[PDB]
Amino acid sequence: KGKLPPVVSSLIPFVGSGLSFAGGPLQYTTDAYKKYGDIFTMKVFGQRLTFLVGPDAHVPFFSQGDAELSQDEPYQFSVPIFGPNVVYGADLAHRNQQLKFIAASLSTKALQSYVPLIVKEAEDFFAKWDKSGTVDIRDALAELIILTASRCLMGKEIRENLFTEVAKLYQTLDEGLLPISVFFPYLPIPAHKRRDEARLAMVRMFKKIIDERRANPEVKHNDCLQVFMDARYRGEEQALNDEEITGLMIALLFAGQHTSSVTGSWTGLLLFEANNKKKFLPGVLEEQEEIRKEFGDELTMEALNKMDKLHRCVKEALRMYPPLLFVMRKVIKPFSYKDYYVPEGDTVFVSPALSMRVEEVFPNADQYNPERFVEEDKQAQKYRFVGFGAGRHGCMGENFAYLQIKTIWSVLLRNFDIELVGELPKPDYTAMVVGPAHPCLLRYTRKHH
Numbered sequence: 001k002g003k004l005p006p007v008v009s010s011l012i013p014f015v016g017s018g019l020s021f022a023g024g025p026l027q028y029t030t031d032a033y034k035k036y037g038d039i040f041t042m043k044v045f046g047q048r049l050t051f052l053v054g055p056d057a058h059v060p061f062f063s064q065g066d067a068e069l070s071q072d073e074p075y076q077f078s079v080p081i082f083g084p085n086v087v088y089g090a091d092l093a094h095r096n097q098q099l100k101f102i103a104a105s106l107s108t109k110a111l112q113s114y115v116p117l118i119v120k121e122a123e124d125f126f127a128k129w130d131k132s133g134t135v136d137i138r139d140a141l142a143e144l145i146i147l148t149a150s151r152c153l154m155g156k157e158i159r160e161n162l163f164t165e166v167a168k169l170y171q172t173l174d175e176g177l178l179p180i181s182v183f184f185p186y187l188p189i190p191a192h193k194r195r196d197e198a199r200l201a202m203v204r205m206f207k208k209i210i211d212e213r214r215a216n217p218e219v220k221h222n223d224c225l226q227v228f229m230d231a232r233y234r235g236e237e238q239a240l241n242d243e244e245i246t247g248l249m250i251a252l253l254f255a256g257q258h259t260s261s262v263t264g265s266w267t268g269l270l271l272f273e274a275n276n277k278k279k280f281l282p283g284v285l286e287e288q289e290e291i292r293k294e295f296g297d298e299l300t301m302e303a304l305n306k307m308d309k310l311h312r313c314v315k316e317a318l319r320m321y322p323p324l325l326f327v328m329r330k331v332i333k334p335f336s337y338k339d340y341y342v343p344e345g346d347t348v349f350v351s352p353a354l355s356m357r358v359e360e361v362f363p364n365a366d367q368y369n370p371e372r373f374v375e376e377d378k379q380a381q382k383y384r385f386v387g388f389g390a391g392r393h394g395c396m397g398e399n400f401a402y403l404q405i406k407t408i409w410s411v412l413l414r415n416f417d418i419e420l421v422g423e424l425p426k427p428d429y430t431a432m433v434v435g436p437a438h439p440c441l442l443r444y445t446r447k448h449h
Ligand code: HEM
Pocket: 071, 099, 102, 106, 252, 253, 255, 256, 259, 260, 263, 318, 322, 323, 324, 327, 328, 386, 387, 388, 389, 390, 392, 393, 394, 395, 396, 397, 398, 400, 401
């Protein structure tokens, strides 16, 4: 020992926190921070869960690598969803390579030639609205992101032919992921048997396409799938098999939908809220106008990357309502932070939500102020904002996401007047995909296309 961080109280034998933590996750971890500060521990059926709040506290979590902090135990729910030997079900030698291949397929070189695809989809999608009306922005953006992701991740075969079949197989997999599924990933309920069956179907679907492509050698494709098909395990001629390629597909597909789709929605919902509109919208519209002068009606990456004021509106919707509540590692080598000592065996927690609501980090943290990031971007200290994580395993889609969300909102900002229906949605912290609560409504008054 050295000094163990404060165990959070509870009078209920054996379960301890558990019942209070599940149902109230953000609220309970938040009250723990006020009671026990920076770093604290929850016992639930004798599992120590140590929590880290604020930049000083994050440093043990994001600095250490794989032989000091492991991802496999607390991300085991992913394994039957993605498949055997995929990502967190893969041995570190095999995993980090796959993670390298994922990085290639979402690199700035790859993302340049995805932007046209991203833009076209966004544009064809929003064309098909009326002169006027009212949508659920969450639903709408959810539809579009899977649709473009279908093309960018999976290819155009899958896009033009097989989309609604894929959108079906996916809906199953998100339906085989319940609270219960994170605790017992292979529990033989029906939802998991649908899921297990779906995943096996999606493998067979991608079998069709890879056979096709290898029988037509020279025809070039521009998608993630093509990168994965040409990925090769170091030393080994080996080369990924079909079951593995789908897993990565399924993994990235999931990413789009569990996160891009919800901050996507948040950005708009927050921007077009009437006090947040009266202050931060004009600045964004003048930004579009000044970008249109330099580049024209076209959206290219070059244009999108200059959209700094909008970029911030996205980054602030991520600061306030980040889609993933916890990131997690089981501790291998023990470690120290302040006077305290975290021992081998504990699962350590960081809460993007909570750490980004800390006053001494973000002054006025309950307020929407995108332009807080003008000075924040200059700050020296690592790990203040954590929406996309950090370190050896920070997000690899952060560019892709900012791109896709900006595309959506540029295309929307330009072609429509938008207004928030009713008052701002509450967040759904106690749900599987932590979004805004329906009805997430926007009235659209079009203007002059
Ligand atoms: C607003 C949207 C998103 C947010 C907030 C987000 C957030 C994060 C966070 C916090 C992590 C770290 C997980 C950890 O600590 O182990 C992460 C990892 C990752 N994200 Fe995202 N993400 C987003 C969108 C995407 C998209 C669209 C993709 C891919 C298409 C993607 C791919 C990944 C990958 C591959 C990792 C793994 C890092 C690793 O283990 O090497 N993400 N993301």
